[model samples]
Target: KKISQYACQRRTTLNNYNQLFTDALDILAENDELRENEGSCLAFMRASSVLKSLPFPITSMKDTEGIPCLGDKVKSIIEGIIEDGESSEAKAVLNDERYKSFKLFTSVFGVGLKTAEKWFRMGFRTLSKIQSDKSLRFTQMQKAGFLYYEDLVSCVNRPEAEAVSMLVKEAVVTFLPDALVTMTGGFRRGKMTGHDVDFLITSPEATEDEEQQLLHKVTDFWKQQGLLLYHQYHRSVFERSFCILKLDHGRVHSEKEGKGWKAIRVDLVMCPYDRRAFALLGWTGSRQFERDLRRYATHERKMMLDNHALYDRTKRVFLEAESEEEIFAHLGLDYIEPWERNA
Candidate 1:
């Protein structure tokens, strides 16, 4: 019954799911994900988190009786599963027009619950509605989200991910030959297909002044090469860039007929060498895993972690590490390999 509140501390292998139990909670979690009640959403997430860590399938209510985070509300959902083998509420939720709208609206890259609700109340259903709505102008984020709807929703296969990785390496090589262009999202975590490919770029030659302008230089080259298409560019404290690129796709259909290129959403982050290890750990996330990792750093270790560095408030110093293993060790955590971070 000693369940860890921190998911980082839980060794969750992708095996043995009690589908009947978790599905009900998962629907409830997504239901909350689309609602204004975020605290309840996280409570459901934590309840779902507990079930995800179970090594064996759940059979009876007694199996989960002593587990942490399983509250009365979620307990009722599992009770339904124990009796009926499925949740009628979950099936009915699938039929709810509101639930359908939330899924449609929030599936976009930038759209959040608030934005989704705003559109839903306005009687918007499809991305085409965002494209066509004239009474209320759509946000720039939604426009890009609408325009790249097809390509963005499409999976980035292994070859596609690798091609982008190479393309990024080639671009950075023009300025910093020895620069590191490491793909950090699901791809790095051994996922063959991901929603989008995220890469972390750091040049050994780059320092304060040079690092400040690195994103501009790369994007400039990309613009010159006509690779950038419908980018939601942002610049700030951290030198990172969000972009949509037009990659030359499907072996170049020359001879007058080619599938030439398609749009892609790419996230590039630039980190200094001193912060590379922490950046890798932060960005190599399974969304839920990172949240718990940072939570553990704060609540358990009295440390603060971000993409850039980990700070020990007690020691009042930035904890430095050359590799992720060292950072995990510094936090007194058993190092979780990237592949295993797939919570």
Candidate 2:
């Protein structure tokens, strides 16, 4: 079978047989991204993402045949990995001071590339130095991030994710009993652990006002229960909250070392009943998959797609879909399931 250049066309399961090559490529890609080299960054990301869908490991140069997105630069990196059993390129990136600083700083919840670079330029090396500096002002989000740094950085397992799901469902239903609370993101793709838990909430009978207030109401209820350690709502096309929830030790599967609770990052999105499908597809992402999906829609089909809706440029109208299958159908693509979208 001919592999497609677009990630959306491939079934990328979580079982990656080519992690060696992909890991090296991912490091290069992240370095490129941190350096703001968009072209180089995307090239590496696409190469790595394509390799993740491979059914077998690439043992020789001949194994690279018929593969898409592997250009000369990416091929060379793969070649090096094959010979040395490790990538010198990736090792160099790991050793590089700037890349290390950027990686460490950006691990915090609220820090981005810009902020990380700023701290780097100012000669700040560690989180302790940054925390001790009275000259720097921390955003409320960063404050919470530093406060719960240990818990936020830990991988969220399935049992804990289920516990968070229960909390989200219980809170959302308290406000609108008809609302659907769906766990999205990598967990929904059958990944055992993730950095955060994301959810999509919608109700068939929700009104404009009710839809608008749902997230606020839910977060407020959590705050009353002391479950919400930190939360902030963003006003967008959809009402959403980026929150840190305090999960009781009892709810989690393991009893931590004398800790009564753990801080978990959770995101809740409230969308209109009509836009549920589009929102779900967008939020349930491996980033590369969603990027390629939109790119394929616009360039390959003359259709514009986003989290809200899909628009056919030739038809000059919006296309409606009640499910992701319908959206893929509209684009003349085979249905890619949530678990196979790990590209």
Candidate 3:
């Protein structure tokens, strides 16, 4: 069988069957991405993407012969996995002092690669070091991360997701009474647990000023209620908002946390009615699938696909679709349902 180069076209199972490969390559990919080496990161990611789509265990290198992303570097890693149970390079990375420290620091919700690298350069390996080190100034998000260290590391379960969703719906409706608030992301793909919840905010009453005000209103409401722990407006020609929402944890966590609230990450993007379907499809992603979809549209189909809109380069018109199925059709792909898209 010809392994599709398109990550979106490949029917990767929800269980990404080959741990022997992806588990290691993803680490290298993370390492590359952390360094801001985008090409290297994508190559590593592309390799792991194919492995994750396998229907069963990869018994040997022969099993990967025609796969799309495999090349010399990945082959060496797989050969190592075939002969030993692990990749030597990956194992080395796991034990590397810098990578180990980076892992620990970046595991905190707000900390990113640069912050981890900064602290690592200062001879800090433990979270406590950053906590006690007065020399390093902390951002508001970083402070909240440390404050909720243990709880934030854990995944948000389905029940917790619904609680946050309920809160978001309330806030959204209060501002735009008929606005569409659709949950998009792993949760929308029927995930049992996810790192965070994502939503696309849109309304029939669409205008640039209206959309901006709608988001501002909801954000203001959350701030007034003290439920918006952190908010970063990612400005662009079309802006999107990211927030850390605090939800009551009484029913979710019964443990003796004296505080009744828990922090949950929320992403809100404003979309016009015309682009809402595309937004839904783009954000309801398994990372690999989204990348593949973008690659497939651009490289193979000579089209452009992004979260906001899809354009056909040849025709030079925006291709409009009202649903995910139609979006896939426009891309000349088999329509993958949200659950089946767990690449």
Candidate 4:
């Protein structure tokens, strides 16, 4: 009960705060050194989170002067970044060898931490080495990663995301006239570039019963026209994360069982109209922000927020929200547009 009580009080704030910090850290840690140094990374991450949770950028030291989480050390670092262009700790970590190797290895698609660590131990230092070693097997996604590793690492810019959205829209309309597709994730919130793209696919008439047929028709058309890469189909049960077809890939190649189509990563999730607001909120997320929002809803508001719907635990009933703005209004937060959600 105490845990729950604490969770209720800080879930939303913590979740949003953590995500904002993580995103900044992710940007800084892109360089090998910063990513490698655990302490520095953590420190910068904490600072970033603190900065993000604030209503506005710090114009004066006094802005962060009294925040409980803003320790002296973190404050100094924040001051450095806010006044100067960069962080000393971030710069120091950028050149570390271990992080460099890890970054290089994990940069490959389909390669996880274990694989990267194993490769590092085996003296597989370069992409060429990984590719040349005939004994070492790579998955289809990995192969794409290996082939287009550089491109994949390069962020997908807003223009490219828009183009991809257009492609998805064309396919959806051509295949399923009533189907709708909204770009989610960072792009939806208006980020310039992102690691990957996310889309929410649905229709006004998309009831549970019609979901399968909708997925079948749309994916079939995309596959037929040679536009799919990696796709997984999952039915929506009440317990499932979301129903509808999940499609991830590009259209440069043909559809194959294991291998994705074009080298890009895409996620397409479908939901019913009634659940669209929450679904959009969850999927159009900076992961942590959504997590915090849900935590806040459940803990502070006595409500459970999921991709499908919001449940009021105190009343043991569903809280109906016609729009995302309405949902935020219910939670007593100013409506945060998708683009401002980088936190």
- Against the unseen true structure, what C-alpha lDDT does each candidate score? 0.80, 0.94, 0.84, 0.62
Minimal lDDT window, size 10, model 1: 250-259
Q: Is candidate 1 or candidate 4 better by TM-score?
A: 1
lDDT of 3 by residue, 211-231 (tens): 877777888999998888878
Q: Could you list the CA RMSD of all candidates, in the order they appear?
A: 3.2, 1.2, 2.3, 7.5
- Residue 146 lDDT (model 4): 75
**What's the lDDT for candidate 3?**
0.84
RMSD of 4: 7.5
Stretch of 10 with least lDDT, candidate 2 = 249-258
The model with the greatest TM-score is 2
Q: Judging by lDDT, tell me the better candidate of 1 and 3.
A: 3
Tens-digit lDDT string for candidate 1 (269-340):
888877889888989987888899889899988999887889998999999899999999988998787877
Q: Return the TM-score for candidate 4, rounded to 2 decimals.
A: 0.74
Q: After superposition on all CA atoms, how large is the RMSD of candidate 3? A: 2.3
lDDT agreement of model 2 with the native: 0.94
Q: What stretches of model 1 exceed 4 Å from their correct place? A: 251-260
Please give, for residues 170-288, the per-residue lDDT of candidate 4 as tens digits: 86677557887888887776676787777887778655666656656666766676655445566654212211122345532322246542245666676777777888888877654
| Candidate 3 residue spans exceeding 4 A from truth | 251-258
